[PDB]
């Protein structure tokens, strides 16, 4: 089984800065390597495939390079949108294997439309946290309700 | 009488493959084989002029074209000698090559022996494009892998 | 678009069958992948199916727990997890793409798996129903913590709007 | 008049190299270039028969020898290149039996540099050059 | 600068056993790689060069393999003489760089051929000389202070 | 029969120059490169540089740009390493070796260099009586440390005997 290994495991960087994640495979994967980005808690998304080819609708600030065992994803000028976990996957050999991910966050810097977009961004996060609690307590009900139907 | 050739494709990128050529007498040249690590779709497939591998696939030079014609598809009259059109990769990233061609050869003035096969990034537009470039390269894009064509057993 | 089934919540040992309805492309022209992500952890690739011939590759880690299938007619892919444990509490993403990219990692279906019933088997009916009613105040209390948490996050933004 | 060829050596091992061939008219073939990653000393340097690279350097087959044979030699037998303490060999060879056209053409065949003085450390198919 | 990286950093193995050190370069070094062995308080010795070629006078139980970025030294049947630190060096790019070394020691009816006994004298004399020079360097400041 | 004879153990003050030598017999150093390798105590090998005696071309590790200077005398068939501005960082064993660019065919037995210093300013704020008591205290301390080593090696002999 190919062990693909990323570093750093997490990383902090200012806006505008140039960032470089790496991914290192335990064997030659001849550039059969894809980079996936997963923002907060939304679905994974394809950035790069075959090591260096950008996917559709990917900002050009993203670039991928490398060969053999060692590959890297490079964001040239880091926007705030790009805070995410990034994953490398190899499909050279089965099973497909994935890096453990690099988490990437900001450390900081230094319009009614802008304040209200920031306000609504809390809503999905809060609703998600509430739904965790609901399902938590639904699993506590579950045994008791089974005993009632006995 | 029966000439055989072979070509091992290599690049910095993910493309690999072995191409086989057979030609009995002055029959057509049967190109065959398999290319891996391609994107799904069509990819320009051309004999370039030189078997010079010193600078990757760039040193292969332009399409093999002794008749100083313009770029075209394999069935066109107006085409380069090297222009074998497109190979087609599936969702598995693999292309099965199967091509028969009369303009190329494994001997004489139109010999490809000692020259380079190149598979390309994009589809070859067969010279039917809306720019200068189309009648040169067919807008096939960059060269993903190449190999010198050698005599086979 | 890839429409995945809705959130599941099941007992240990349960079977569950997730679905993935594709619209915009014929799944026959792709591979349909499944990806697991346990909370606060990374992606595991489970397997894929080639709907054109129902050939399936799996990660050995999952072969036997997970079962991938496709209905080419309804243009839908399926993932079936059996003998579920807490290990399996995760978000399952379906995706579609060539062999070299899951060009459609999207949506995602949360699956949650619960867990001692010895307490409820031998108990008195009065006692089980008191334990059941105790849960509502506890849950409402935990929700109110979350509300005040997010009220404190609103507070700065609302000050800036003034 | 002037035919040119070129060859890029590659192997599993540390050997690398570019070989150049020039031939005016039916004069001799001037072989030239550089091989790196050799051990100090002499290394067999031969044109093998096939430009078949499908199975590394093994698929090149035996020495290029159409005459089924110094006077008694194979056509491909170009003797030895010499590597220095720097692990480098400067190739400089002139030969009349090999050619870049006709019955004795090496175009489309393989150059091989060897482990010892005359296994295959590296090889490459010989292509037409600018 | 190429970082060549060895593992394990140390290891223990029984006689007769088959041992495999690895060396991993941060870049392709096209088999420009040499293995050196160094017993305690002795000068390094060349085992292998160009990744796989044994040096002169090297027991054949030693073998080397690998390519690209990943290489390995393998002792087929480990004798007691082979307790040492092993180093990989790459000379593909300058500067030449070296692994941090793998230390190799034994784990838990010999021949009379006394070699182990004679090895002790040089080792002890060497350790004493370290102590002498250590205390010579401690005198040095005091003697300087006496002259002023 | 090939041999590399290196100079003997050095022991010097901070800031001192030292020049190590490597006398080769059994081969002409012109046919090789003469390398130098440093090994700090309880640490691995660092390659310093090499010289091609045939043309006095020298490659160095940039780390040793400033400290180290390699030279050869083709007549006396000897290679030289010169370390300047010595600090405690430089306390190490320096091995010379000879070989092609791809291997070291021959290794020297190695020359230990030890560098002593900052202790002195500590002792200048003292009396002559006090500096000479500190000096005499060293002999028992050293003899004690040597006796530890003797008994250490006596216990290693014991099983073998």
mmCIF file of C-alpha atoms in Angstrom, chain E residues 1 33-34 36 38 41-46 48-50 87 91 94-100 117 120 124 127-128 131-142 144-146, chain F residues 11-12 35 39 43-47 50 59-63 95 101-110 114-117 119-120 123-124 131 135 138 142 145-146 149 153 160:
data_model
loop_
_atom_site.group_PDB
_atom_site.id
_atom_site.type_symbol
_atom_site.label_atom_id
_atom_site.label_comp_id
_atom_site.label_asym_id
_atom_site.label_seq_id
_atom_site.Cartn_x
_atom_site.Cartn_y
_atom_site.Cartn_z
ATOM 1 C CA UNK E 1 20.949 21.102 -0.480
ATOM 2 C CA UNK E 33 25.091 7.068 -3.927
ATOM 3 C CA UNK E 34 27.790 5.537 -1.728
ATOM 4 C CA UNK E 36 30.159 3.814 4.193
ATOM 5 C CA UNK E 38 32.357 2.911 10.469
ATOM 6 C CA UNK E 41 36.821 4.579 17.006
ATOM 7 C CA UNK E 42 37.895 3.534 13.502
ATOM 8 C CA UNK E 43 38.007 5.452 10.219
ATOM 9 C CA UNK E 44 35.102 5.093 7.716
ATOM 10 C CA UNK E 45 35.320 2.404 5.047
ATOM 11 C CA UNK E 46 33.703 2.281 1.620
ATOM 12 C CA UNK E 48 29.264 0.410 -1.919
ATOM 13 C CA UNK E 49 29.419 3.058 -4.638
ATOM 14 C CA UNK E 50 27.096 4.044 -7.471
ATOM 15 C CA UNK E 87 26.273 6.150 6.334
ATOM 16 C CA UNK E 91 27.381 12.938 -4.904
ATOM 17 C CA UNK E 94 27.160 19.659 -4.664
ATOM 18 C CA UNK E 95 27.549 19.927 -1.847
ATOM 19 C CA UNK E 96 27.897 16.219 -1.150
ATOM 20 C CA UNK E 97 25.585 15.341 1.718
ATOM 21 C CA UNK E 98 25.366 12.418 4.110
ATOM 22 C CA UNK E 99 22.714 10.542 6.056
ATOM 23 C CA UNK E 100 22.696 10.854 9.839
ATOM 24 C CA UNK E 117 40.111 -9.040 23.660
ATOM 25 C CA UNK E 120 39.853 -3.367 24.071
ATOM 26 C CA UNK E 124 40.749 2.148 26.513
ATOM 27 C CA UNK E 127 39.324 7.017 26.112
ATOM 28 C CA UNK E 128 42.138 7.886 28.544
ATOM 29 C CA UNK E 131 40.417 12.609 29.454
ATOM 30 C CA UNK E 132 44.013 13.887 29.355
ATOM 31 C CA UNK E 133 43.294 16.469 26.634
ATOM 32 C CA UNK E 134 40.045 17.345 28.436
ATOM 33 C CA UNK E 135 41.981 18.282 31.581
ATOM 34 C CA UNK E 136 44.734 19.957 29.529
ATOM 35 C CA UNK E 137 42.061 22.333 28.185
ATOM 36 C CA UNK E 138 40.893 22.976 31.769
ATOM 37 C CA UNK E 139 44.449 23.908 32.822
ATOM 38 C CA UNK E 140 44.855 26.222 29.819
ATOM 39 C CA UNK E 141 42.637 29.117 31.131
ATOM 40 C CA UNK E 142 44.026 28.880 34.680
ATOM 41 C CA UNK E 144 46.633 32.169 31.268
ATOM 42 C CA UNK E 145 45.163 33.843 34.383
ATOM 43 C CA UNK E 146 48.427 33.219 36.272
ATOM 44 C CA UNK F 11 44.931 20.813 20.659
ATOM 45 C CA UNK F 12 44.729 24.546 20.207
ATOM 46 C CA UNK F 35 38.623 14.516 0.150
ATOM 47 C CA UNK F 39 33.095 14.120 12.344
ATOM 48 C CA UNK F 43 27.862 12.816 15.514
ATOM 49 C CA UNK F 44 27.919 11.800 11.853
ATOM 50 C CA UNK F 45 30.192 12.557 8.902
ATOM 51 C CA UNK F 46 30.222 15.961 7.214
ATOM 52 C CA UNK F 47 32.006 16.274 3.883
ATOM 53 C CA UNK F 50 37.952 17.838 -2.179
ATOM 54 C CA UNK F 59 35.062 22.079 -4.383
ATOM 55 C CA UNK F 60 33.854 22.978 -0.888
ATOM 56 C CA UNK F 61 30.649 22.688 1.067
ATOM 57 C CA UNK F 62 29.580 26.350 1.518
ATOM 58 C CA UNK F 63 29.287 25.570 5.245
ATOM 59 C CA UNK F 95 39.472 12.236 7.939
ATOM 60 C CA UNK F 101 34.204 11.467 -7.704
ATOM 61 C CA UNK F 102 31.863 8.563 -6.981
ATOM 62 C CA UNK F 103 33.603 6.746 -4.106
ATOM 63 C CA UNK F 104 36.402 6.940 -1.555
ATOM 64 C CA UNK F 105 38.826 4.115 -2.364
ATOM 65 C CA UNK F 106 41.176 5.017 0.509
ATOM 66 C CA UNK F 107 40.599 6.528 3.967
ATOM 67 C CA UNK F 108 43.038 7.996 6.486
ATOM 68 C CA UNK F 109 43.098 6.938 10.134
ATOM 69 C CA UNK F 110 41.894 10.444 11.027
ATOM 70 C CA UNK F 114 40.356 19.709 20.091
ATOM 71 C CA UNK F 115 39.651 23.385 20.784
ATOM 72 C CA UNK F 116 39.529 24.810 24.313
ATOM 73 C CA UNK F 117 38.353 29.254 26.286
ATOM 74 C CA UNK F 119 36.683 30.144 31.278
ATOM 75 C CA UNK F 120 39.667 32.525 31.603
ATOM 76 C CA UNK F 123 39.325 33.340 36.771
ATOM 77 C CA UNK F 124 40.928 36.786 36.245
ATOM 78 C CA UNK F 131 43.925 30.366 40.642
ATOM 79 C CA UNK F 135 44.727 24.304 39.125
ATOM 80 C CA UNK F 138 42.184 19.317 38.429
ATOM 81 C CA UNK F 142 41.277 13.785 36.103
ATOM 82 C CA UNK F 145 37.790 10.103 35.702
ATOM 83 C CA UNK F 146 40.581 7.867 34.350
ATOM 84 C CA UNK F 149 37.414 4.266 32.603
ATOM 85 C CA UNK F 153 37.079 -1.708 30.782
ATOM 86 C CA UNK F 160 35.939 -12.630 28.128
#
